[PDB]
User: Which sequence fits this backbone?
């Protein structure tokens, strides 16, 4: 078993060499470069009094949810900087937040090991605790809503599990990681998802089957960010080694690396534009960098955050890119 | 041990499309959707809800 | 404050 | 005399450098603290002090050009009233804000529990705008009893006039002298004795507590405390002392003029007080490490 | 527009509630506990439990404390240790009678050395470069009788002698303080867990009061 396991691992690399014919950057040299992108802070959301760790963009491209360790979950009207709701969290130690695609539920999680879903469509008018998902021994790092009924939550206990809000119990549990899971992203068809863990490995998970469909090992440090390409056939992971790596699901290859010499700080959050050409990744150097997903050329900078940027999200319509940092402000870019 | 080997064998039998084909296919998606990317192609302030 | 006479 | 000529020219350059330094420092302090970091009670006090000093130094060149020509006021009555009112309000507010910062630091040191619990932003705004109300109350005589007076020679000096209020030369003179004495007493007591006693006691108790509890890991805190106290004293005490000496002997000065040294000694003391006002942003705000870091990052 | 005004008025009402709640959140002392392996963390909270992360909130001498326990967090510490950047103080618990004891997970590494490694990590942590540490040495009653049977040669070979409670506790306390590489900015308030009433919480109140003074003077430019 041990003898063949080493050869099996080499077999993946051996089959990778035959697949590795031409790099993504080599083919895309002839394409027209994006150039320089000038994004200005259109709106600054000043409603938090503590460090902000995660945000999620709504499907309507109007309402976004922001999570900070102040004990409050705020629904932001990004168009007019209006606070739709101010959810008082039972546990202030929240590091992730989710917004339902329908828009009726928001889920927050953190070191309390409980993923609490909140109902924004209460008849009385005040947000109440709809559910409290218990069953994770490790800290909740990222939660994403497949729909109103099902949610997938990544935890620090090395296992990410799929949950049912109505049932309140784990529908299935995904295992196979080594380090603590930090980031999770859902596919457009919600039939697949990936989880970034501390072992510098990205695992492709099948929601229905519940087993690791595919494993990617190209990073060198803790993977804190991950996000699929809009087409769903590729994804980019942001790790602590200051390198964004693009992986192809259909190729089992490291497509190309987005790294620079001027950056040595880790990567907190990554995301893609509507077309997926602009890979906007947050960093620990107090500013965000826009990366060309096809040539690794830095196409812009989103400096202006007083503290370290932790969350960065691209809205579905592509109107804006909201970046939140530890200075308790959210900045709306364009 | 046994669980790790089984997971490795499951991913070993998958179909690995050549990276050259994957790279070309990935670029095709960006070309088609570049016309509707506000970040790549800025639109006038009338279209932008953010002034 | 000012000494004005 | 050569010495008297220097004694008159020196206040001009003193107020010039005072205006430049005050405007620069107050603008930097406002732009940094009031817009590029979170609101704090100490931050609120710093913005109040910076605004008072900036509003004072904004009108400083008018006083500079007024005393450049023997206290003549080249501008109109309304402008003289506005500038004098603004200067008096800003000076009283700045002194009251120095006293309030001393009191707030004393409260934070002696009773940290009360500062942790009962010291909030809204209460800070109320108790920081209260001193502005006190400054307006003390400036009310400048609001009322100040008009422009033109001498027969053609020169104009907008000083305190009492023809309308009195209506009788003896009664007008009596009202003038009693109001001037009351103004001098109020300036000496509320302007100087009230804050200086507060500043000395408050900073003294902080030094006493920090020495008893042994938080002194460096000489910098003691240097900052003694710098604040010494600057405030050596700047305001000469001016208030000269004003008190002038007010107590004002009958002789107006009737005969036995003590003419006060008339030429007011200007250097006022210059030193204005220098204190302009150095307040450097002495109070720039000492903090967070503000310096924000400024160098800017 | 009337419709936007109603929506805007809701934001102002929400903004009013946020600052009032922020005042209540900023008037309470936040404390973090570290050190597992029967180090006395559970013992400490018992005397100060008058009123995921185990959060307890008690008020002593009109000062509100809000303690946090991360013992149940068995994952990587550095992935979430930055969440506590800004706490008033860190209450570290060390079992005095642990030099002879060995960790259950690893029988080749001393339990006492493990406590120093974790204590040194948070002293050298970038997120706690200025936060004072209220170090607590627990089980002093159990330590004063175990000191005679077993010397410090098992844990500290470089021990001169004087196997007594007074001498050994000071050496153990001094060893922990030597791990504080950021001197002149972090003050370690070492204490022995006393069974007397109100004495254990009094030291925490006194230590937090000193930290509050230092924090207040730092923000006003005095420090």
Assistant:
């Amino acid at each position: 078993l041990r003898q063949e396991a080493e050869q099996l691992k080499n077999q993946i690399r051996d089959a990778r060499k035959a697949c590795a014919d031409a790099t993504l950057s080599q083919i895309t040299n002839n394409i027209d470069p994006v150039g320089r992108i000038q994004m200005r802070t259109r709106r600054t959301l000043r409603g938090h009094l503590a460090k902000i760790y995660a945000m999620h963009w709504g499907t309507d491209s109007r309402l976004l949810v922001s999570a900070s360790q102040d004990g409050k979950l705020i629904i932001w009207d990004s168009y007019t900087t209006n606070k739709v709701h101010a959810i008082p969290l039972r546990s202030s130690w929240v590091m992730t937040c989710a917004y339902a695609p329908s828009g009726n539920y928001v889920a927050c999680g953190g070191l309390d090991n409980i993923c609490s879903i909140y109902n924004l469509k209460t008849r009385e008018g005040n947000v109440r605790v709809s559910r409290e998902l218990a069953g994770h021994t490790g800290y909740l790092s990222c939660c994403r809503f497949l729909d109103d009924n099902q949610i997938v939550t990544s935890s620090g206990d090395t296992t990410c599990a799929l949950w049912d809000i109505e049932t309140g119990q784990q529908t299935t549990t995904f295992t196979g990681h080594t380090g603590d899971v930090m980031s999770l992203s859902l596919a457009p068809d919600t039939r697949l998802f990936v989880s970034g863990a501390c072992d510098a490995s990205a695992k492709l998970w099948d929601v229905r089957e519940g087993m690791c469909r595919q494993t990617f090992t190209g990073h060198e440090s803790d993977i804190n960010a991950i996000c699929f390409f809009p087409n769903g056939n590729a994804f980019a992971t942001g790790s602590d080694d200051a390198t964004c790596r693009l992986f192809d699901l259909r190729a089992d290859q490291e497509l190309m690396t987005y790294s620079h010499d001027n950056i040595i700080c880790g990567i907190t959050s990554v995301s893609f534009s509507k077309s997926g050409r602009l890979l906007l990744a947050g960093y620990d150097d107090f500013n965000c960098n826009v990366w060309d997903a096809l040539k690794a050329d830095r196409a812009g900078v989103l400096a202006g955050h007083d503290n370290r940027v932790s969350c960065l999200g691209v809205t579905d319509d592509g109107m804006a890119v909201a970046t939140g940092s530890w200075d308790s402000f959210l900045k709306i870019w364009n | 041990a046994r669980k790790l080997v089984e997971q490795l064998k499951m991913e070993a039998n998958i179909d690995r499309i050549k990276v050259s084909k994957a790279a070309a296919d990935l670029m095709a998606y960006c070309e088609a959707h570049a016309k509707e990317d506000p970040l790549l192609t800025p639109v006038p302030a009338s279209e932008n809800p953010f002034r | 404050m000012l000494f004005i006479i | 005399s050569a010495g008297y000529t220097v004694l008159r020219i020196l206040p001009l350059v003193v107020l010039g450098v005072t205006f430049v330094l005050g405007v620069l420092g107050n603008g930097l302090v406002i732009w940094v603290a009031g817009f590029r970091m979170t609101r704090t009670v100490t931050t609120i006090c710093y913005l109040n002090l910076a605004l008072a000093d900036f509003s004072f130094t904004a009108t400083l060149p008018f006083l500079i050009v007024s005393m450049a020509m023997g206290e003549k006021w080249p501008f109109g009555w309304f402008l003289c009233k506005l500038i004098h009112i603004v200067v008096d309000i800003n000076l009283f507010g700045s002194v009251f804000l120095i006293g309030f910062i001393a009191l707030d630091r004393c409260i934070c040191v002696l009773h940290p529990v009360w500062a942790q619990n009962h010291r909030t932003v809204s209460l800070a705004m109320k108790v920081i705008v209260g001193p502005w109300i006190l400054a307006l109350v003390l400036t009310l005589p400048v609001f009322l009893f100040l008009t422009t007076v033109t001498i027969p020679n053609g020169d104009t000096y907008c000083t305190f006039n009492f023809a309308s209020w009195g209506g009788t030369p003896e009664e007008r003179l009596k009202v003038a002298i009693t109001m001037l004495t009351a103004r001098g007493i109020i300036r000496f007591v509320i302007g100087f004795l009230l804050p200086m006693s507060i500043v000395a006691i408050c900073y003294g108790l902080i030094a006493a507590k920090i020495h008893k509890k042994g938080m002194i890991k460096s000489s910098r805190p003691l240097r900052v405390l003694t710098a604040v106290v010494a600057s405030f004293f050596i700047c305001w005490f000469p001016f208030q002392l000269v004003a008190l000496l002038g007010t107590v002997w004002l009958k002789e000065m107006l009737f005969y003029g036995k003590y003419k040294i006060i008339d030429i000694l007011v200007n250097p003391t006022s210059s030193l007080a204005f220098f204190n006002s302009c150095l307040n942003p450097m002495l109070y705000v720039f000492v903090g490490q967070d503000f310096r870091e924000r400024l160098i990052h800017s | 527009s009337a419709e936007d005004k109603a929506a805007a008025e809701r934001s102002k009402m929400i903004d009013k509630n946020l600052r009032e709640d922020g005042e209540k959140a900023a008037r309470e002392v936040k404390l973090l506990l570290l050190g597992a392996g029967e180090s006395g963390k559970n013992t400490i909270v018992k005397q100060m439990k008058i009123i995921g992360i185990v959060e307890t909130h008690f008020t002593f001498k009109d000062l509100h404390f809000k303690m946090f326990d991360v013992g149940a967090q068995r994952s990587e510490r550095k992935k979430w240790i930055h969440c506590f950047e800004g706490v008033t103080a860190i209450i570290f618990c060390v079992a005095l009678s642990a030099y002879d004891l060995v960790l259950a997970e690893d029988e080749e590494m001393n339990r006492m050395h493990a406590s120093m490694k974790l204590f040194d990590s948070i002293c050298n942590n970038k997120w706690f470069t200025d936060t004072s540490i209220i170090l607590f040495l627990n089980k002093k009653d159990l330590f004063e009788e175990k000191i005679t049977h077993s010397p410090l040669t098992i844990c500290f070979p470089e021990y001169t002698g004087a196997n007594k409670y007074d001498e050994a506790a000071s050496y153990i306390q001094s060893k922990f303080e030597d791990l504080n590489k950021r001197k002149d900015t972090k003050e370690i308030y070492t204490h022995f867990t006393c069974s007397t009433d109100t004495k254990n919480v009094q030291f925490v109140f006194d230590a937090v009061t000193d930290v509050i003074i230092k924090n207040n003077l730092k923000d006003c430019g005095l420090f």
